[PDB]
Amino acid sequence: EKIPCSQPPQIEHGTINSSRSSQESYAHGTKLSYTCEGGFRISEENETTCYMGKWSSPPQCE
């Protein structure tokens, strides 16, 4: 029984780029991408995925 995930994690300076408030929870499998401020570089592959209602170690903005 896979569980849904809740609001994606947060990473200093940058945030998720889904469309802020659409839903509250997401389903298992979901793959959202990330975005940083206008002038920040993000580490390799700007994406986060969900596994059993938890997300994966999100990228960071440098």
PDB file of C-alpha atoms in Angstrom:
ATOM      1  CA  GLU A   1       0.000   0.000   0.000  1.00  0.00           C
ATOM      2  CA  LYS A   2       1.804   3.105  -1.279  1.00  0.00           C
ATOM      3  CA  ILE A   3       0.904   6.323   0.480  1.00  0.00           C
ATOM      4  CA  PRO A   4       0.469   9.836  -0.924  1.00  0.00           C
ATOM      5  CA  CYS A   5       2.999  12.543  -0.126  1.00  0.00           C
ATOM      6  CA  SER A   6       2.246  16.009   1.294  1.00  0.00           C
ATOM      7  CA  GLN A   7       3.632  19.468   0.336  1.00  0.00           C
ATOM      8  CA  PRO A   8       7.156  18.965  -1.215  1.00  0.00           C
ATOM      9  CA  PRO A   9      10.232  19.903   0.928  1.00  0.00           C
ATOM     10  CA  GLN A  10      11.867  23.374   0.882  1.00  0.00           C
ATOM     11  CA  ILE A  11      15.481  24.286  -0.062  1.00  0.00           C
ATOM     12  CA  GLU A  12      16.971  27.680   1.063  1.00  0.00           C
ATOM     13  CA  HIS A  13      16.464  30.467  -1.571  1.00  0.00           C
ATOM     14  CA  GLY A  14      14.690  28.185  -4.067  1.00  0.00           C
ATOM     15  CA  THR A  15      11.291  26.473  -4.038  1.00  0.00           C
ATOM     16  CA  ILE A  16       9.324  23.872  -6.013  1.00  0.00           C
ATOM     17  CA  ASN A  17       7.940  24.885  -9.466  1.00  0.00           C
ATOM     18  CA  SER A  18       4.667  22.908  -9.634  1.00  0.00           C
ATOM     19  CA  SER A  19       2.232  25.888  -9.354  1.00  0.00           C
ATOM     20  CA  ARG A  20       2.504  26.629  -5.598  1.00  0.00           C
ATOM     21  CA  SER A  21      -1.010  25.692  -4.352  1.00  0.00           C
ATOM     22  CA  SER A  22      -2.971  23.272  -6.519  1.00  0.00           C
ATOM     23  CA  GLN A  23      -3.245  20.279  -4.191  1.00  0.00           C
ATOM     24  CA  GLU A  24      -2.111  19.604  -0.611  1.00  0.00           C
ATOM     25  CA  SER A  25      -1.085  15.989  -1.130  1.00  0.00           C
ATOM     26  CA  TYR A  26       0.378  14.196  -4.191  1.00  0.00           C
ATOM     27  CA  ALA A  27       0.515  10.466  -5.079  1.00  0.00           C
ATOM     28  CA  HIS A  28       3.380   7.973  -4.937  1.00  0.00           C
ATOM     29  CA  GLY A  29       5.588   8.114  -8.039  1.00  0.00           C
ATOM     30  CA  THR A  30       5.095  11.878  -8.564  1.00  0.00           C
ATOM     31  CA  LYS A  31       8.195  13.648  -9.941  1.00  0.00           C
ATOM     32  CA  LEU A  32       8.233  17.444  -9.434  1.00  0.00           C
ATOM     33  CA  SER A  33      11.082  19.732 -10.580  1.00  0.00           C
ATOM     34  CA  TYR A  34      12.786  22.562  -8.664  1.00  0.00           C
ATOM     35  CA  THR A  35      13.669  26.236  -9.351  1.00  0.00           C
ATOM     36  CA  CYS A  36      16.011  28.839  -7.793  1.00  0.00           C
ATOM     37  CA  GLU A  37      15.897  32.668  -7.730  1.00  0.00           C
ATOM     38  CA  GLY A  38      16.822  34.807 -10.760  1.00  0.00           C
ATOM     39  CA  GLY A  39      20.622  34.441 -10.618  1.00  0.00           C
ATOM     40  CA  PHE A  40      21.240  31.136  -8.758  1.00  0.00           C
ATOM     41  CA  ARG A  41      22.560  27.887 -10.258  1.00  0.00           C
ATOM     42  CA  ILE A  42      21.113  24.533  -9.123  1.00  0.00           C
ATOM     43  CA  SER A  43      23.126  21.348  -8.607  1.00  0.00           C
ATOM     44  CA  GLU A  44      22.746  18.475 -11.154  1.00  0.00           C
ATOM     45  CA  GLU A  45      19.191  17.443 -12.244  1.00  0.00           C
ATOM     46  CA  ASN A  46      16.649  19.810 -10.619  1.00  0.00           C
ATOM     47  CA  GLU A  47      14.032  17.193  -9.671  1.00  0.00           C
ATOM     48  CA  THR A  48      12.553  15.535  -6.577  1.00  0.00           C
ATOM     49  CA  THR A  49      10.517  12.300  -6.522  1.00  0.00           C
ATOM     50  CA  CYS A  50       8.126  10.739  -4.007  1.00  0.00           C
ATOM     51  CA  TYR A  51       8.338   7.252  -2.510  1.00  0.00           C
ATOM     52  CA  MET A  52       5.899   6.030   0.222  1.00  0.00           C
ATOM     53  CA  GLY A  53       4.545   9.520   1.057  1.00  0.00           C
ATOM     54  CA  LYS A  54       8.066  10.969   1.488  1.00  0.00           C
ATOM     55  CA  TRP A  55      10.170  12.930  -1.061  1.00  0.00           C
ATOM     56  CA  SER A  56      13.835  12.460  -2.055  1.00  0.00           C
ATOM     57  CA  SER A  57      16.904  14.527  -1.068  1.00  0.00           C
ATOM     58  CA  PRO A  58      15.999  17.694  -3.082  1.00  0.00           C
ATOM     59  CA  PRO A  59      18.735  19.582  -5.045  1.00  0.00           C
ATOM     60  CA  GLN A  60      20.096  22.852  -3.620  1.00  0.00           C
ATOM     61  CA  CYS A  61      20.725  26.322  -5.059  1.00  0.00           C
ATOM     62  CA  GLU A  62      24.277  27.716  -5.189  1.00  0.00           C
TER      63      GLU A  62
END
